[PDB]
mmCIF file of C-alpha atoms in Angstrom:
data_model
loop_
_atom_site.group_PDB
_atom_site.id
_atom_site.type_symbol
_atom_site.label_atom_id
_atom_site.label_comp_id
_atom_site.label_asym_id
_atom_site.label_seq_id
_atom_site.Cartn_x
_atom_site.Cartn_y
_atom_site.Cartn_z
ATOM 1 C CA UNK E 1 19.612 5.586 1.273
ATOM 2 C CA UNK E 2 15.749 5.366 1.377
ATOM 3 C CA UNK E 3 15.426 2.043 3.102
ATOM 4 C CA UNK E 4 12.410 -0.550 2.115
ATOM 5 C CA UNK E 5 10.869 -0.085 5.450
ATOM 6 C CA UNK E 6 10.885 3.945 4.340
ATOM 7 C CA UNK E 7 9.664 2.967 0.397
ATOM 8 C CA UNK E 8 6.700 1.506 2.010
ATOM 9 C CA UNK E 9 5.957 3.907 4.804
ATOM 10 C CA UNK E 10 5.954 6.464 1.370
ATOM 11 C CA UNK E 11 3.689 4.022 -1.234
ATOM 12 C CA UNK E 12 1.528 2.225 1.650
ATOM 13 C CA UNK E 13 0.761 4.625 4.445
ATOM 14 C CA UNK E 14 -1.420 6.825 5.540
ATOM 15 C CA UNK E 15 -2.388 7.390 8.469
ATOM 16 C CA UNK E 16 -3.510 11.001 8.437
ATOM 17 C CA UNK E 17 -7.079 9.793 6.729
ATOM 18 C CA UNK E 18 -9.505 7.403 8.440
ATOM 19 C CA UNK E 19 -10.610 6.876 4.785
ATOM 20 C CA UNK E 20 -10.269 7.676 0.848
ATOM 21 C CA UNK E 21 -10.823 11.834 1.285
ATOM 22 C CA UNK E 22 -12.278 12.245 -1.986
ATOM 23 C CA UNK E 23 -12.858 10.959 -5.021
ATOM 24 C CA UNK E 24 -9.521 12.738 -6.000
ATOM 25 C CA UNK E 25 -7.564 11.020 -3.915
ATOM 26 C CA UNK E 26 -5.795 8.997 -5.597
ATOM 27 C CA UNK E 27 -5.113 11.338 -8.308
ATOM 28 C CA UNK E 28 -2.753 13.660 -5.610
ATOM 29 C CA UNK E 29 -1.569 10.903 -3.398
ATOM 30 C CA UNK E 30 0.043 8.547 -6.168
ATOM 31 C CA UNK E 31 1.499 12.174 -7.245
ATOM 32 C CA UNK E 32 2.497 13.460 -4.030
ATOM 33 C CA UNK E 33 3.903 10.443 -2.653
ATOM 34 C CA UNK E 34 6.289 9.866 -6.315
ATOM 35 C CA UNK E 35 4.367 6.776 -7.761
ATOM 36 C CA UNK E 36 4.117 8.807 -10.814
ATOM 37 C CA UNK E 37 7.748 10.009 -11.737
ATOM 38 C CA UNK E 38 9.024 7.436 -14.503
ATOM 39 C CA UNK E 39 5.940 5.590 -14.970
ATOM 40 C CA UNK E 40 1.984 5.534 -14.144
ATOM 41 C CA UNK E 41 2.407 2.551 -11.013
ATOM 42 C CA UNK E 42 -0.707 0.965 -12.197
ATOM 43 C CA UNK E 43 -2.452 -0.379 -8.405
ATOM 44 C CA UNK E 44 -1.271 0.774 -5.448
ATOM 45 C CA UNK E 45 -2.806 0.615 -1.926
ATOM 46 C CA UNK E 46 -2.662 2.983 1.035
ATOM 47 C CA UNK E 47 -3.478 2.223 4.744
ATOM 48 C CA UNK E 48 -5.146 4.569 7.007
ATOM 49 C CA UNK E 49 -4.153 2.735 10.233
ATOM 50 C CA UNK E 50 -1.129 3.576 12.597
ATOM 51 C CA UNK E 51 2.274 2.843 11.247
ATOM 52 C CA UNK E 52 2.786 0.326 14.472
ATOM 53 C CA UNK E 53 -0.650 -1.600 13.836
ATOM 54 C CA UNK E 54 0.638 -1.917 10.288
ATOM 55 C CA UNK E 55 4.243 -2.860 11.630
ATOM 56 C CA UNK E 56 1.977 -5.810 14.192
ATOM 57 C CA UNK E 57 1.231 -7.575 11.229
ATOM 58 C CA UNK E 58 4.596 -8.768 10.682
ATOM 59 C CA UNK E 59 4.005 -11.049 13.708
ATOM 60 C CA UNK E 60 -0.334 -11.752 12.497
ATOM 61 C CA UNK E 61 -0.765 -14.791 9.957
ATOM 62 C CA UNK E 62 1.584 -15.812 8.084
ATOM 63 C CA UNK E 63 0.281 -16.568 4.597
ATOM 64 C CA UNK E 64 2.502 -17.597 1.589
ATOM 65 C CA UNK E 65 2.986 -14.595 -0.936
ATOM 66 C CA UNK E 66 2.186 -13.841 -4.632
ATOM 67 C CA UNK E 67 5.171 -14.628 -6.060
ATOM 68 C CA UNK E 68 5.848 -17.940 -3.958
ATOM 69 C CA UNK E 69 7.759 -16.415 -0.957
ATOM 70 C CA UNK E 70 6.766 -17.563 2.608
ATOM 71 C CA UNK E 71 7.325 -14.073 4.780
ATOM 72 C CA UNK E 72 3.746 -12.652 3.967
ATOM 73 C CA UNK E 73 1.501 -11.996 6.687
ATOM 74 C CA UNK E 74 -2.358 -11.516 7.023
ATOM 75 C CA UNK E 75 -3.764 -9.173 9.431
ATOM 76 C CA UNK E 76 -6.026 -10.969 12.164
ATOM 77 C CA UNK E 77 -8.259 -7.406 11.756
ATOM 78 C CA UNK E 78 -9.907 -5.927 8.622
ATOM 79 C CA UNK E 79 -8.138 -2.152 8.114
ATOM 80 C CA UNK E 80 -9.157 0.869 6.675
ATOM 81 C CA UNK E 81 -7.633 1.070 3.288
ATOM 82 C CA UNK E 82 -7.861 2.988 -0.082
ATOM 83 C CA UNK E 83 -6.801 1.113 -3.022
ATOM 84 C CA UNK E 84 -5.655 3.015 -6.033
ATOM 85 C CA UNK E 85 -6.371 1.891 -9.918
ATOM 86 C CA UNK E 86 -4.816 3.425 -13.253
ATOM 87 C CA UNK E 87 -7.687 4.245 -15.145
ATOM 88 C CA UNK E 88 -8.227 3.234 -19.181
ATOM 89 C CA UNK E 89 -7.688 6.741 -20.371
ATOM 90 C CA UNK E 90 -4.615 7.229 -18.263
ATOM 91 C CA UNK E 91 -1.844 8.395 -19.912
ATOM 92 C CA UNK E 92 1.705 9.609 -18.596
ATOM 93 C CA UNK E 93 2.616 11.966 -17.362
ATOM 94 C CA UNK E 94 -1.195 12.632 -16.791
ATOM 95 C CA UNK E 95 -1.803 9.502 -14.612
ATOM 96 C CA UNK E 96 -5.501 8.982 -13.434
ATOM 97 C CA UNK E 97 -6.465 6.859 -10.891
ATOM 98 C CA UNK E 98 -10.068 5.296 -10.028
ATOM 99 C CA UNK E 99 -10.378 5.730 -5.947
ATOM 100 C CA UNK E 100 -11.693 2.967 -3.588
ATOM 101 C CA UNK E 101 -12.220 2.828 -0.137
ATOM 102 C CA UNK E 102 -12.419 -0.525 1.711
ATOM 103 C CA UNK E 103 -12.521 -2.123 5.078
ATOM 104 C CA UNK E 104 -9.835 -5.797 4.595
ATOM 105 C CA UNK E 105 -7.209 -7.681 5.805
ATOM 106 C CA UNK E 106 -4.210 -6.199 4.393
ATOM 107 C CA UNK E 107 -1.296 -8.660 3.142
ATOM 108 C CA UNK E 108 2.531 -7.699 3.714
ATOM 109 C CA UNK E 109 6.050 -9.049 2.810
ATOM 110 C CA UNK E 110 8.356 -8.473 6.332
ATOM 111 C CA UNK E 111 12.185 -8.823 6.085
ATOM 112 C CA UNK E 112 14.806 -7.344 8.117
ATOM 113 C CA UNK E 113 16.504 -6.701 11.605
ATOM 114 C CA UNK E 114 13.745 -5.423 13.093
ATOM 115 C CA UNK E 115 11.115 -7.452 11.150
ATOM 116 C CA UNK E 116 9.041 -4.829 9.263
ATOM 117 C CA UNK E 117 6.703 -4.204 6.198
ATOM 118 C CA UNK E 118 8.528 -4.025 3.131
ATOM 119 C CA UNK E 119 5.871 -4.915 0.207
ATOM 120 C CA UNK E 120 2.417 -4.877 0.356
ATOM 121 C CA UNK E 121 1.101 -7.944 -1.275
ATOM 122 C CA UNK E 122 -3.047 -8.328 -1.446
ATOM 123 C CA UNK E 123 -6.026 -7.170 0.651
ATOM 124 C CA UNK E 124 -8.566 -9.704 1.330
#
């Protein structure tokens, strides 16, 4: 009853922060936000951009995906983003995460009726 568009709006965004608060950021986000229930997710990326210049890119470059699929797209602007890492020593339920802020082009999967984010694929 969560839709994908919701799933990512709760993995991939957040606007609230221009940037990557603190160095423990990570840490309560991939918490906070469930990434950490049945397993450590080991990357994950948030945005700190609105949710409709996020929801533009659907309509931006349109770069093949990852795994092969066509309906990725490449934002024309770089974006404020914090990507999260599982550290070495991370173990579950205790999941650690290394925080980094960057400026990129985010990547996203769109599908759907409207055409919205669903995965996010790669920063560059």
């Amino acid at each position: 009853k969560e839709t994908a568009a919701a799933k990512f709006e709760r993995q991939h965004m957040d606007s609230s922060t221009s940037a990557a608060s603190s160095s423990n950021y990570c840490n309560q986000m991939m918490k906070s936000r469930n990434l950490t229930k049945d397993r450590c997710k080991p990357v994950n990326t948030f945005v700190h951009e609105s949710l409709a210049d996020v929801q533009a890119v659907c309509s931006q470059k349109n770069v093949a995906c990852k795994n092969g699929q066509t309906n990725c797209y490449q934002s024309y602007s770089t974006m404020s983003i914090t990507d999260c890492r599982e550290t070495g020593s991370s173990k579950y339920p205790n999941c650690a995460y290394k925080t980094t802020q960057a400026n990129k082009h985010i990547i996203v999967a769109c599908e759907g009726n409207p055409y919205v984010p669903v995965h996010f694929d790669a920063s560059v």
